[PDB]
Design an enzyme around this catalytic site. Structure first.
Site, PDB file in Angstrom:
ATOM      1  N   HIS A 159       0.215   6.288   5.012  1.00 44.84           N
ATOM      2  CA  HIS A 159       1.598   6.740   4.923  1.00 44.84           C
ATOM      3  C   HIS A 159       2.067   7.408   6.208  1.00 44.84           C
ATOM      4  O   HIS A 159       3.017   6.943   6.836  1.00 44.84           O
ATOM      5  CB  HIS A 159       1.755   7.704   3.738  1.00 44.84           C
TER       6      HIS A 159
ATOM      7  N   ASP B 127       0.801  -1.219   0.000  1.00 43.34           N
ATOM      8  CA  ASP B 127       0.000   0.000   0.000  1.00 43.34           C
ATOM      9  C   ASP B 127       0.835   1.272   0.000  1.00 43.34           C
ATOM     10  O   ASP B 127       0.439   2.260  -0.619  1.00 43.34           O
ATOM     11  CB  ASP B 127      -0.939  -0.028   1.223  1.00 43.34           C
ATOM     12  N   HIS B 128       1.989   1.266   0.665  1.00 43.82           N
ATOM     13  CA  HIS B 128       2.638   2.502   1.080  1.00 43.82           C
ATOM     14  C   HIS B 128       3.665   3.028   0.089  1.00 43.82           C
ATOM     15  O   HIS B 128       3.859   4.246   0.010  1.00 43.82           O
ATOM     16  CB  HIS B 128       3.335   2.313   2.434  1.00 43.82           C
TER      17      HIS B 128
END
Lengths: 493, 320, 212, 506
Positions: free
Chosen positions: D256, D193-194
């Site tokens: 994040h 995801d990040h």
């Protein structure tokens, strides 16, 4: 907060010690309104029993090994929930018969469905019983069925692993209770509250102020009965893994963030995961055996170990132990943890002694030129309390110090103890809180820690190589050498 | 001897099924572990899960019985063989071993008095084989440490002047020192020119190279006897990557011990060289290196290129 | 025994700056059998409430390779070791405060070697006065004379520390004020760092002299 | 240049076995432009097994070569060279193609026998990796069908990768978890995801746990507060529909900006491992909360950027872009104030920030230390210069700390100087792509840089009240607006000055 009603099944009941360990306790619980009046018990096993026979035997048991039956009308009001359904251990047909009996009892007695399964069979039958229980699917709903497994949970690491794998494949790891141990609800909560509610005792608990700790547990009764039980186990699977490995965890544990069982058990496993013996390669600085021979106790003669009934005059089962564990985390790096146990030693007592360090530089003079350092003395045996010793001034026109101590006994400000530990254990099992029980990881880790010494001592050797101590002396001199090799002495107690 | 295969049927009913291992063990002592054959020059096969295929070979010249041993090589997965005696070609057992065994492992520290035997080993590497001598693993930190000096961008141009290199090693076999010299030469495009020898109390050798600019190159090895070898012979004590120019930036010297800092005299010895220090990198253990090399398998580009230069130098030694 | 807290030594012929240099017992004035020291090492030990059991090392010299003054403080190792090094080499963090050549403060610490695995390599930060503040050309004698004329005594001794310093150094001085024994004086070649006995003094315990 | 010619090659590592990466969603011209260019470059330097057959999947089907044509089509637009053309030839033969329907249970039966047939063609080892890369609403239907066919059952030979994002609110995250949990284990699901594999982030641990001075003064006894900052200078590109239903609170603050927070207030792990580290991240996330929950105006301020100036050229406002709806409410600037409740971070507030159309791109983690007890050296300028220690995770990476030193001159004075250390001038090595590092780790298997299952629930719970409260419809003329090119909206500056501290000018 009385738990909801339900029905009990007692596997392997109608045997030995089951009556004296269950019936008086449940009877006292019911008489003290601990349970609703909708509580029933059911027997088991193969011998051809009878309901009237059950009533007569229960009456005899409560009369002989308890306070009594109290009021006759009380027993009349009790005597409606005691049935029986004979069946073999490994008979699926008997299991279906049990399921039908349980269904009929639910329909008639109206117990609302929730159940708790109690197991009390011989320890060499757990796998077949658990597998056949899981075959019929008696454990599907989450709060409907709890199974309790009696002592002991295997002998060596492999047996424990196999039992864990068998258990994991039948029911979710939320209903299994391993009972075990005997630390009640007093000592554990008392120690945790004392540690985590004060703003002075916490900062002095790391490795830069503490030097070493000792943990002692002693008993005076001999081998007594269960010679066959003791001969197959010895005092390393009896008191050094069940009991003595809980004081270590509670003493050397990082602070939690909550109170429910999850955080406590997680912290205990995390601490237990970073421990090891001292000298794995050479098992002469991390262990001493023993055995108690003939001696004097209470002004009367007492025979040695190899004179009791049922024990052959060549056995090498230990009755004493001494280890030296060491932790390897960011807080307790380089502080030994001397442990201990035994039998036939005098002055039955338990203790947890913490010894602090000496001051940076000394400017004063000691009377005996010894300068005994400060000590905390948490106690667990009778006369519980906390005692601490420090320095004072000798009266006169001179500067000398002398060791004096404060004291605080729970028996003065308190003394009204709770009920029997068994009663509280059963109540907690009924309501449901796994704080006082043990998870799988804890058991496996304890076995891994103790494995090397156990394997080494299990191997056969010379019959007369056992260090021997008479009944009454504190320990064989080998333990004294183990502790004096570094300088710190055994606590005189 | 004939019971080696027949008894296996009894063992078959009775395990570890992985790659096999072999050993020779010249020494008379003691006289995935799938099939361990403890040759020590009859049959003593007994498999006890660490299956044992140990054969007592107190009688030498067991090449003939090695025909069935080759059949007993267990060809199911790639396997490994240890040859901890010496290099040879007359003894025909090696020829059968190299063709049969997938890979072999040797150590360049137990060699006898002759030194040209290493040359014979070096020649075999050029022919397509599989040798992963563990002595190369001991140079892992030294090679890494050498590259540490030139890392920052300021010293980028310093590497283009290097002309003087000296190596100090314990008295005895120079297999470990020659390998390091070959490595640095390969990375700067050097080629051998001449090879002399100056025997003495220190055994000062001499090697000369060429360059794209055709500037002369000078290097020497010193065999300082310490008389305190730690169970392993022929290890580096220090090195010096000096300069022979007029306006050169600076050199680099890496001490390793108190006595190893004896190069702090003369002109600029403690002034024209920036002296660092290393704690200790010497006398490792054979067990840990063996496991790591066992884990990996294949062909190494760095080792082959270094051994290419070593072959050239030794071929000129007899003529030089 | 004074062989664990002090070692003397004279300097002899050697090489300095690309040219030969004469030895001590070959110069004008000095007799050819003098025993005057030209290098002194010590090991003090402060015993107050905060520096207990932490030793201090001191060493002057003459005819050393370069002119430097320093003060280096070495911190202890981590209680637990999990990260491996990149070259099987472990070093502790060190703070230093240079004095003579280019005054400044320096510090050293570890950081990860870029790549794919987890290894550490030594690195350092820096700070110099001449690149941030400026360049000072002050003369000590000028400031001293101005202070004497005005009077703000802070850099002048009270004679109590004079007596204390003399008491601290007296045993070594009395021991070294000895009969001749001309051949019983260690010698270190002019250009090296120290005679081997000081090296042994520091290495008997484990730590090593900072190769400045 | 040619830094360190001694560094040709010394490392030793290898991906274990071959495998077939069955990329889902071969349509949409996103796989052809993101994944395939990435893997092809890795193959050029021999970082993979010899044969990496890729089986594209889509509802619509093309010819075997026609599918290969679009694979090349996207290569050219991001071409970094081809060398000898024969390299692509074996690559073109290596890649196969199949087809089917996304929601047809029997379609996978056509699929399952297909790659099974390729197993008999290649016989490398047999390995399956899934990289479903379609719209979030397709995540449940794709997962359930795999379980029905049961074609992923080996715990060691099956790996499944879930693409960003993961949900909308707390009720959405739990719903996806139930589906995956019942049909998969925990050591098989990867949740990239990040894109935070940036080398400095895993450096934030070595610098903290391998030293002996930096640990003792890192707790509530010395630290005053912490300011974590992230800023960009690129506005919303024409793809606004994806951003329209997202908001900058849900876009770069839940996934994040919280990773920088978990790595700055965590306890030292006992030993480096896979689960021995991620277990420590969860504990701190279970003891954090907003500063005030009743009066939400004291623990959060939204905003939106309007027309202004960025680089000497006029810049249109947010409600002018080609696709956004006039009179919107989706925030762009978000700020919070978290607190930690445990035995070493009690009473030390944390301030977080983010935004768009800010003057320049940076990223900092500024730690501020307390003030000295005695103030004998009063000096000048009120001595209002406490010493800070600031890390950096952006261009000009390095570590810098400030401290006071004497100013030349007879009179006593105190200036402010700092000593620093930058990676560029100490190692001399160019940066590396972060995306490539994550893909390589998906083969070996570490699960160190990928968030766990229960941890992603804790991130959603922390901002529970903020997300719900702002989502309610409100007056269009009630969202503070700030100009393009300036740091903060007017309201947000008052949050920090009330306590007595000022935002780092940076």
């Amino acid at each position: 907060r009385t738990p909801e009603p339900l029905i009990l099944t007692i596997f392997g009941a109608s045997g030995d010690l089951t009556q004296r360990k269950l019936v008086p306790a449940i009877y006292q619980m019911k008489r003290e309104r601990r349970l609703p009046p909708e509580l029933t018990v059911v027997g088991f096993a193969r011998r051809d029993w009878s309901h009237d026979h059950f009533r007569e035997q229960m009456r005899k048991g409560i009369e002989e090994f308890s306070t009594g039956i109290g009021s006759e009308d009380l027993w009349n009001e009790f005597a409606q929930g005691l049935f029986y359904c004979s069946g073999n251990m490994d008979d699926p047909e008997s299991y279906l018969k049990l399921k039908n009996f349980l269904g009929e009892l639910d329909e008639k007695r109206n117990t609302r469905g929730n159940r708790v399964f109690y197991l009390a069979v011989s320890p060499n039958f757990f796998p077949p019983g658990i597998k056949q229980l899981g075959a019929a699917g008696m454990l599907s709903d989450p709060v409907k069925s709890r199974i309790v497994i009696e002592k002991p949970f295997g002998r060596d690491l492999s047996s424990a692993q196999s039992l864990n794998r068998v258990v994991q494949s039948v029911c979710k790891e939320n209903q299994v209770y391993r009972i075990d141990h005997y630390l009640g609800k007093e000592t554990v909560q008392n120690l945790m509250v004392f540690r985590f509610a004060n703003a002075i005792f916490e900062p002095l608990w790391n490795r830069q102020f503490v030097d070493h700790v000792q943990i002692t547990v002693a008993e005076t009764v001999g081998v007594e009965e269960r010679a066959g039980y003791y001969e197959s186990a010895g005092a390393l699977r009896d008191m050094v893994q069940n009991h003595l490995m809980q004081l270590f965890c509670l003493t050397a544990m990082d602070p939690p963030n909550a109170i429910d069982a999850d955080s406590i058990r997680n912290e205990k496993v995390k601490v237990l995961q970073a421990t090891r013996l001292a000298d794995i390669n050479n098992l002469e600085n991390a262990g001493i055996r023993g055995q108690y021979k003939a001696g004097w106790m209470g002004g009367k003669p007492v025979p040695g170990y190899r004179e009791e009934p049922g024990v052959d005059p060549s056995s090498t089962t230990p009755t004493f132990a001494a280890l030296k564990l060491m932790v390897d985390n960011w807080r307790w790096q380089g502080v030994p943890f001397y442990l201990r146990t035994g039998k036939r030693m005098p002055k039955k007592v338990s203790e947890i002694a913490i010894q602090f360090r000496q001051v940076p530089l000394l400017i004063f003079q000691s009377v005996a030129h010894q300068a005994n350092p400060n000590v905390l003395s948490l106690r667990i045996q009778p006369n519980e309390g906390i005692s601490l010793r420090f320095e004072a001034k000798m009266p006169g026109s001179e500067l000398r110090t002398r060791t004096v101590d404060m004291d605080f006994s729970y028996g003065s400000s308190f003394g009204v103890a709770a009920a029997d530990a068994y009663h509280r254990l059963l109540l907690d099992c009924m309501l449901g809180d796994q704080t006082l029980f043990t998870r799988a990881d804890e058991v496996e880790e304890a076995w891994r820690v103790v494995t090397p010494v156990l394997s080494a001592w299990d191997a056969p050797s010379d019959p007369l190589s056992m260090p021997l101590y008479e009944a009454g002396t504190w320990e064989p001199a080998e333990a004294e050498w183990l502790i004096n090799k570094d300088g710190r002495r055994w606590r005189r107690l | 001897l004939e019971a080696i295969e027949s008894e296996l049927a009894q063992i078959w009913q009775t395990r570890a099924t992985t790659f096999s291992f072999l050993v020779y063990e010249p020494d008379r002592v003691q006289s995935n572990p799938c099939r361990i054959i403890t040759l020590c020059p009859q049959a003593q096969l007994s498999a006890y899960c660490c299956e044992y295929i140990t054969l007592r070979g107190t009688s030498d010249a067991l090449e003939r019985i090695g025909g069935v041993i080759t059949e007993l090589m267990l060809p199911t997965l790639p396997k490994y063989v240890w040859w901890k005696a010496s290099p040879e070609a007359e003894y025909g057992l090696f020829q059968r071993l190299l063709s049969h065994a997938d890979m072999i492992i040797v150590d360049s520290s137990i060699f006898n008095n002759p030194e040209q035997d290493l040359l014979q080993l070096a020649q075999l590497v050029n022919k397509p084989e599989a040798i992963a001598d563990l002595n190369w693993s001991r140079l892992a930190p030294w090679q890494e440490l050498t590259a540490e000096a030139f890392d920052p961008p300021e010293r980028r141009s310093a590497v283009g002047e290097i002309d003087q290199i000296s190596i100090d090693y314990e008295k005895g076999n120079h297999a470990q020192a020659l390998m390091y010299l070959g490595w640095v030469a390969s990375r700067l495009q050097w080629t051998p020119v001449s090879y002399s020898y100056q025997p003495g109390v220190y055994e000062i050798h001499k090697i000369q190279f060429c360059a794209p600019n055709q500037r002369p190159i000078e290097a020497e090895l010193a065999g300082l006897p310490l008389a305190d070898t730690g169970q392993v012979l022929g290890d580096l004590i220090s090195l010096k990557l000096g300069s022979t120019n007029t306006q050169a930036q600076c050199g680099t010297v890496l001490c390793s011990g108190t006595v190893g800092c004896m190069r702090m005299e003369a002109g600029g010895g403690a002034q024209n060289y920036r002296v660092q220090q290393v704690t200790a990198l010497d006398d490792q253990n054979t067990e840990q290196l063996l496991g790591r090399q066992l884990q990996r398998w294949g062909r190494d580009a760095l080792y082959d290129e270094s051994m290419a230069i070593v072959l050239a130098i030794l071929q000129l030694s007899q003529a030089g």
